[PDB]
Design a protein around this motif. Structure first.
Motif, PDB file in Angstrom:
ATOM      1  N   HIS A  20      -7.685  -0.798   2.281  1.00  0.00           N
ATOM      2  CA  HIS A  20      -6.547  -0.905   3.183  1.00  0.00           C
ATOM      3  C   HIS A  20      -6.754   0.022   4.365  1.00  0.00           C
ATOM      4  O   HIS A  20      -7.190   1.158   4.193  1.00  0.00           O
ATOM      5  CB  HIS A  20      -5.221  -0.599   2.483  1.00  0.00           C
ATOM      6  CG  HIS A  20      -4.032  -0.829   3.366  1.00  0.00           C
ATOM      7  ND1 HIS A  20      -3.276  -1.984   3.325  1.00  0.00           N
ATOM      8  CD2 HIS A  20      -3.528  -0.087   4.379  1.00  0.00           C
ATOM      9  CE1 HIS A  20      -2.335  -1.924   4.253  1.00  0.00           C
ATOM     10  NE2 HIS A  20      -2.459  -0.779   4.903  1.00  0.00           N
ATOM     11  N   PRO A  21      -6.426  -0.444   5.576  1.00  0.00           N
ATOM     12  CA  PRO A  21      -6.702   0.372   6.773  1.00  0.00           C
ATOM     13  C   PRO A  21      -5.666   1.457   7.107  1.00  0.00           C
ATOM     14  O   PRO A  21      -5.700   2.005   8.214  1.00  0.00           O
ATOM     15  CB  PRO A  21      -6.700  -0.669   7.900  1.00  0.00           C
ATOM     16  CG  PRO A  21      -5.695  -1.730   7.409  1.00  0.00           C
ATOM     17  CD  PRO A  21      -5.921  -1.786   5.911  1.00  0.00           C
ATOM     18  N   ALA A  22      -4.767   1.781   6.197  1.00  0.00           N
ATOM     19  CA  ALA A  22      -3.663   2.698   6.534  1.00  0.00           C
ATOM     20  C   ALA A  22      -4.183   4.028   7.106  1.00  0.00           C
ATOM     21  O   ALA A  22      -5.147   4.578   6.580  1.00  0.00           O
ATOM     22  CB  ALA A  22      -2.773   2.945   5.311  1.00  0.00           C
ATOM     23  N   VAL A  23      -3.550   4.505   8.191  1.00  0.00           N
ATOM     24  CA  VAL A  23      -3.883   5.767   8.916  1.00  0.00           C
ATOM     25  C   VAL A  23      -4.990   5.567   9.956  1.00  0.00           C
ATOM     26  O   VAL A  23      -5.096   6.332  10.915  1.00  0.00           O
ATOM     27  CB  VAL A  23      -4.187   7.013   8.008  1.00  0.00           C
ATOM     28  CG1 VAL A  23      -4.252   8.315   8.850  1.00  0.00           C
ATOM     29  CG2 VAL A  23      -3.115   7.186   6.942  1.00  0.00           C
ATOM     30  N   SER A  24      -5.760   4.488   9.818  1.00  0.00           N
ATOM     31  CA  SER A  24      -6.880   4.221  10.745  1.00  0.00           C
ATOM     32  C   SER A  24      -6.521   4.151  12.237  1.00  0.00           C
ATOM     33  O   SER A  24      -7.315   4.563  13.101  1.00  0.00           O
ATOM     34  CB  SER A  24      -7.614   2.929  10.371  1.00  0.00           C
ATOM     35  OG  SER A  24      -6.764   1.795  10.537  1.00  0.00           O
ATOM     36  N   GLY A  25      -5.341   3.618  12.546  1.00  0.00           N
ATOM     37  CA  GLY A  25      -4.909   3.517  13.929  1.00  0.00           C
ATOM     38  C   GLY A  25      -4.815   4.881  14.600  1.00  0.00           C
ATOM     39  O   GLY A  25      -4.891   4.994  15.821  1.00  0.00           O
ATOM     40  N   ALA A  26      -4.635   5.926  13.804  1.00  0.00           N
ATOM     41  CA  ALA A  26      -4.543   7.260  14.377  1.00  0.00           C
ATOM     42  C   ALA A  26      -5.896   7.658  14.979  1.00  0.00           C
ATOM     43  O   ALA A  26      -5.939   8.493  15.867  1.00  0.00           O
ATOM     44  CB  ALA A  26      -4.131   8.255  13.349  1.00  0.00           C
ATOM     45  N   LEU A  27      -6.980   7.066  14.477  1.00  0.00           N
ATOM     46  CA  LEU A  27      -8.349   7.323  14.985  1.00  0.00           C
ATOM     47  C   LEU A  27      -8.824   6.428  16.147  1.00  0.00           C
ATOM     48  O   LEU A  27      -9.512   6.904  17.049  1.00  0.00           O
ATOM     49  CB  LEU A  27      -9.374   7.240  13.847  1.00  0.00           C
ATOM     50  CG  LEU A  27      -9.287   8.299  12.745  1.00  0.00           C
ATOM     51  CD1 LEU A  27     -10.099   7.906  11.500  1.00  0.00           C
ATOM     52  CD2 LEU A  27      -9.734   9.631  13.282  1.00  0.00           C
ATOM     53  N   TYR A  28      -8.447   5.152  16.132  1.00  0.00           N
ATOM     54  CA  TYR A  28      -8.961   4.163  17.085  1.00  0.00           C
ATOM     55  C   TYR A  28      -7.970   3.678  18.156  1.00  0.00           C
ATOM     56  O   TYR A  28      -8.379   3.023  19.127  1.00  0.00           O
ATOM     57  CB  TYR A  28      -9.559   2.936  16.328  1.00  0.00           C
ATOM     58  CG  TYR A  28      -8.541   1.942  15.732  1.00  0.00           C
ATOM     59  CD1 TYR A  28      -7.808   1.079  16.543  1.00  0.00           C
ATOM     60  CD2 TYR A  28      -8.334   1.865  14.356  1.00  0.00           C
ATOM     61  CE1 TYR A  28      -6.885   0.183  16.005  1.00  0.00           C
ATOM     62  CE2 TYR A  28      -7.397   0.965  13.808  1.00  0.00           C
ATOM     63  CZ  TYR A  28      -6.693   0.133  14.631  1.00  0.00           C
ATOM     64  OH  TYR A  28      -5.780  -0.770  14.088  1.00  0.00           O
TER      65      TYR A  28
ATOM     66  N   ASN B   2      -6.317   3.182  -0.126  1.00  0.00           N
ATOM     67  CA  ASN B   2      -6.055   3.698   1.202  1.00  0.00           C
ATOM     68  C   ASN B   2      -7.204   4.612   1.611  1.00  0.00           C
ATOM     69  O   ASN B   2      -7.093   5.837   1.526  1.00  0.00           O
ATOM     70  CB  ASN B   2      -4.715   4.451   1.187  1.00  0.00           C
ATOM     71  CG  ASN B   2      -3.527   3.496   1.099  1.00  0.00           C
ATOM     72  OD1 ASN B   2      -3.401   2.598   1.919  1.00  0.00           O
ATOM     73  ND2 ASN B   2      -2.666   3.676   0.094  1.00  0.00           N
TER      74      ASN B   2
ATOM     75  N   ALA C 154      -6.952   7.584   4.299  1.00  0.00           N
ATOM     76  CA  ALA C 154      -6.076   8.653   3.803  1.00  0.00           C
ATOM     77  C   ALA C 154      -6.747   9.575   2.772  1.00  0.00           C
ATOM     78  O   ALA C 154      -6.495  10.792   2.746  1.00  0.00           O
ATOM     79  CB  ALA C 154      -4.769   8.057   3.178  1.00  0.00           C
TER      80      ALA C 154
ATOM     81  N   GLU D 258       0.820  -1.226   0.000  1.00  0.00           N
ATOM     82  CA  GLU D 258       0.000   0.000   0.000  1.00  0.00           C
ATOM     83  C   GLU D 258       0.841   1.258   0.000  1.00  0.00           C
ATOM     84  O   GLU D 258       0.320   2.374  -0.165  1.00  0.00           O
ATOM     85  CB  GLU D 258      -1.038   0.024   1.142  1.00  0.00           C
ATOM     86  CG  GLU D 258      -0.510   0.505   2.487  1.00  0.00           C
ATOM     87  CD  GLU D 258       0.449  -0.485   3.159  1.00  0.00           C
ATOM     88  OE1 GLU D 258       0.463  -1.665   2.755  1.00  0.00           O
ATOM     89  OE2 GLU D 258       1.178  -0.073   4.090  1.00  0.00           O
TER      90      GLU D 258
END
Ligand SMILES: [Ca+2]
Ligand SMILES: [Ca+2]
Ligand SMILES: [Ca+2]
Ligand SMILES: [Ca+2]
Ligand SMILES: [Cl-]
Lengths: 399, 397
Positions: free
Chosen positions: B255-263, B230, B233, B167
């Motif tokens: 793709h879950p990229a950047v999602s961890g910044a939210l959860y 993505n 993003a 990704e």
């Protein structure tokens, strides 16, 4: 030649070095490949590197809090916020307790982003407001009201001499008044009112609807005489906003609203720092005015993030500087402190400050102008307020 | 959950005696702003639908949940209207986290949903009654088109259903997305006369927003098997336009990229099942990538069960195929069968390229594990006549 990101993370001490190396390689070239001699050396230039590892604290349970700096070669990016974010905090954002603290961006990459179309100087020129903070009022109520009711509410604010009136960012329903009908109508009312005030109060209209028609709508709204576009940048995405800021036909300032951003920066140990989300990225994306939580409301960004934020908006570079519009706790009594914090390049972002005024929005606006006058003439507010009932009432209610 | 409103549940910290006032102010402040015209506008006003105390602190604080009903009439059919309403200004009010959204069918139908879904992806690939096997490129940036074609070949020689770009693949300096799709499609057809399967290619969809739809169409027309997106993003509304467009006639791989910044944080942001499950299906992901329970960092059991439910629950939209990531090795296949059933994509990176015999055997070992499960033969037993599976067991167990 690379973006250098600083992360704050928790882990075990003896894993830090390997974890950092894995990040630097895995998020750039992915992995080394069985290529011939020449090819490896050439591929090497696409590989990331670990720039620094700093242990901040050692916990009794054996965990460490550390900062790691990783360099990502700019040649792997493609000039979009997507490429930038997915690379520096894409998969990495999910790797437990970790937070993106700093992005140091090379000139070559900064210049691929649009930056503000207007900036500080262009907003002032459009509105004809110089050598003083600007004054902005916010609609207290939108949804459910008729165009006629809306117009009157706009008029009340403008009768206070304000430079700018913005929709509340939650205004999405077009059942009673479409954005295009609001721009047209508030324009006429503004014209009427300028004959008493001497100022045509501008309108920042919420930019809304499906992405595929967003740029065309932005263009129409400009053509119709909107003073600014209110954009929920984080909800829509930075690349979406970038195209608006780049388009010459979107000939209107962008007013960046921070809705949703707290989901990224609220936690002290996860996410992305508020100065990046509301400061650095906003200027790159093209905000001409940036709204962010003030140090004077119930929940602040904290001193350190707030200073870094302002420096992002103002730092000398290739893009124009952005006007800060700090929100919450904004009242006429705070005006002199606000002059000290931000100088004249400031938007007084009033809400309850206008509508909470005992004498109505009109008086609520006059109050801010009274305080602006006092500051300009070195007069104490309490002294100035002897001849100015608006400021007087404002000093009474909020100190 | 009211037929006329989205009900959001928030976990938050506040003083006990402050909860009703804060809830009421939210309900009003984020719908009408402030107050015989009343009954007319009353239709747009929100309301408090629950206040629950979870834990009492000695500092006089409480952790609590509050449910707020937001009239659907105030929304405009976009993710931007939804997110800004339920968690725009509210997201910045200290310790508060969006835990749940109960959305009526009338709202759900305003979003596109998957174009293909589970059943559409199976028909397109012609792969039924078994998990799908997907491999990820191990290296992309800086390799030449020819080197990339050989790489794709190695994975396809293992007979896998799907190969996806990493990704992080953005640079077009060596091989454009258009060029990769043309060359990989030609390679896949060469390999299919030996494997009997034309391995599909999920290409990273990249570039400025104003030209993304046009590019998605081109890549579909050139024969991409799917578009890797993505989603977080770019923004969900960007992706919703893709899922709604009939000429973007290929599956979307989220793709879950950047999602961890939210959860990522327990006390702030938006729950992972919302970000990577509920919202993805509405936006039109046909296959959804999310952290499995078997890598170093998971979503946790509860979130994972909630996420899978969002993807599968019967409703207006088609179901999504789950592609759990991390720790995916042939040895885990029976467990993954038990957790996911056959509607599952086996999402292997290291599981394939880290095989002692290279990418070809890595994929072959995954179909070996599938054969063993289908026939009720334990992997240890199946490996006796299956060297690819045997070597995988030796390495990862
Ligand atoms: Ca520019
Ligand atoms: Ca507001
Ligand atoms: Ca549909
Ligand atoms: Ca990857
Ligand atoms: Cl936290």
């Amino acid at each position: 030649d690379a973006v250098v990101a600083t992360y704050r993370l928790r882990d075990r001490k003896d894993k830090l070095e390997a974890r950092a190396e894995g990040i630097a390689v895995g998020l750039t070239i992915g992995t080394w490949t069985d290529l011939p001699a020449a090819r490896k050396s050439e591929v090497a230039k696409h590989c990331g590197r670990v720039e620094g590892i700093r242990v901040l604290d050692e916990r009794p349970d054996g965990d460490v809090v550390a900062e790691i700096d990783i360099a990502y070669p700019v040649a792997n990016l493609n000039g979009t916020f997507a490429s930038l974010l997915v690379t520096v905090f894409g998969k990495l954002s999910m790797d437990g307790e970790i937070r993106l603290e700093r992005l140091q961006m090379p000139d070559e990459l900064v210049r691929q982003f649009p930056g503000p179309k207007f900036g500080v100087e262009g907003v002032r020129r459009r509105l004809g407001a110089y050598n003083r903070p600007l004054v902005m009022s916010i609609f207290k109520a939108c949804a459910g009201l008729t165009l006629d009711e809306l117009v009157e509410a706009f008029g009340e604010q403008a009768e206070g001499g304000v430079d700018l009136v913005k929709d509340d960012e939650i205004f999405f329903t077009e059942a009673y008044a479409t954005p295009e009908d609001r721009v047209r109508a508030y324009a006429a009312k503004a014209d009427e009112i300028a004959q008493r005030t001497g100022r045509r109060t501008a309108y920042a209209v919420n930019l809304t609807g499906p992405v595929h028609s967003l740029r065309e709508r932005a263009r129409r709204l400009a053509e119709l005489g909107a003073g600014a576009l209110l954009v929920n940048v984080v909800a829509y995405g930075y690349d979406v906003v970038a195209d608006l800021a780049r388009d010459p036909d979107v000939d209107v300032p962008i007013l960046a609203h921070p809705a949703v951003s707290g989901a990224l920066y609220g936690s002290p140990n996860y996410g992305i720092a508020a100065d990046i989300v509301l400061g650095q990225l906003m200027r790159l994306a093209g905000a001409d005015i940036g709204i962010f939580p003030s140090m004077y409301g119930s929940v602040t960004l904290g001193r350190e993030a707030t200073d870094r934020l302002l420096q992002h908006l103002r730092a000398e570079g290739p893009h124009k500087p952005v006007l800060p519009a700090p929100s919450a706790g904004i009242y006429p009594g705070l005006v002199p402190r606000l002059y000290q914090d931000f100088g004249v390049d400031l938007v007084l972002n009033a809400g309850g400050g206008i509508h909470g005024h005992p004498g109505g929005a009109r008086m609520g606006g006059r109050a801010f102008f009274d305080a602006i006058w006092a500051v300009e003439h070195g007069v104490p507010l309490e002294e100035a307020a002897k001849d100015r009932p608006a400021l007087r009432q404002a000093l009474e209610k909020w100190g």
